């Protein structure tokens, strides 16, 4: 094949193959009162989908069924994104309250149970991503005074009583910051159609 743009897809999907394997491997590490595990299995499914889809896309450099299956994977994923996009939009508070309950159970097990490497890693990343600590402003104090290894960066104890907690940012992420999720969703939508067109171009180009 003459076109090197077909050769680009191998590197692009191989990134998501390793990312799929890492996300799958990290999700299994977090697996190591079920709502916290309910959110963990979503990461297991996401990590497994990105692995086998990233497998077909990456291994598409070998050049077929393999490539044709990869194109069908992008079509079904695009239709499920539309379904998850419209439904997730109309139920924006349903998943928001579920992210709350996920964060609440993760924070409880991280503070009370000191041997919970999974609960700490989840809440710590939630803290570094949202600049929060504790569920309520009272939980911000209990976490900062006791389990300060969870609060993000060098945030002191006094700085958490005035800052907004995660139960404020989780809602603000879904309410005011829904434009951010819309961007990320469309970004996934435009890279799917871009890989879809480039997949049938590769199939029409590999014919020699
Ligand atoms: C389970 C729901 C509610 C959470 C959202 C899951 C999303 C973020 C996950 C699940 C499946 C994932 C996709 C799986 C396959 C591909 C094709 C690949 O070439 C680019 C990455 C891409 C497009 C992944 C993007 C992220 C993805 C869409």
Curated annotation (Swiss-Prot):
Residue spans, topological domain Cytoplasmic: 63-65, 201-208
Primary localisation category: membrane
Family per record: Belongs to the tetraspanin (TM4SF) family.
Gene3D superfamilies attached to this UniProt entry: Tetraspanin (1.10.1450.10)
Any matching Pfam family: Tetraspanin
Binding-site positions, cholesterol: 195
Species the sequence originates in: Homo sapiens
S-S bonds: 132-166, 133-151
Localization per record: Cell membrane; Basolateral cell membrane
Transmembrane segments: 8-28, 42-62, 66-88, 178-200
InterPro entries (UniProt xref): Tetraspanin/Peripherin (IPR018499), Tetraspanin_animals (IPR000301), Tetraspanin_CS (IPR018503), Tetraspanin_EC2_sf (IPR008952)
Gene Ontology annotations of biological process type: CD4-positive, alpha-beta T cell costimulation; cellular response to low-density lipoprotein particle stimulus; humoral immune response mediated by circulating immunoglobulin; immunological synapse formation; macrophage fusion; myoblast fusion involved in skeletal muscle regeneration; osteoclast fusion; positive regulation of adaptive immune memory response
CC per GO annotation: basal plasma membrane; basolateral plasma membrane; cytosol; extracellular exosome; focal adhesion; immunological synapse; membrane; plasma membrane
One MF annotation (Gene Ontology) recorded for this entry: virus receptor activity
UniProt topology in membrane: Multi-pass membrane protein
Mutation effect (residue 102 to A): No effect on integrin binding
Reported modifications of this chain: Not glycosylated.
Tissue expr: Expressed on B cells (at protein level). Expressed in hepatocytes (at protein level). Expressed in monocytes/macrophages (at protein level). Expressed on both naive and memory CD4-positive T cells (at protein level).
Quaternary organization: Homodimer. Part of a complex composed of CD19, CR2/CD21, CD81 and IFITM1/CD225 in the membrane of mature B cells. Interacts (via the second extracellular domain) with CD19; this interaction is initiated early during biosynthesis in the ER and enables trafficking of only properly folded CD19. Part of a complex that includes MHC class II/HLA-DR molecules and IFITM1. Interacts with IFITM1. Interacts with IFITM2 and IFITM3. Part of integrin-tetraspanin complex composed of CD9, CD81, beta-1 and beta-2 integrins in the membrane of monocyte/macrophages.
Designated name of the protein: CD81 antigen
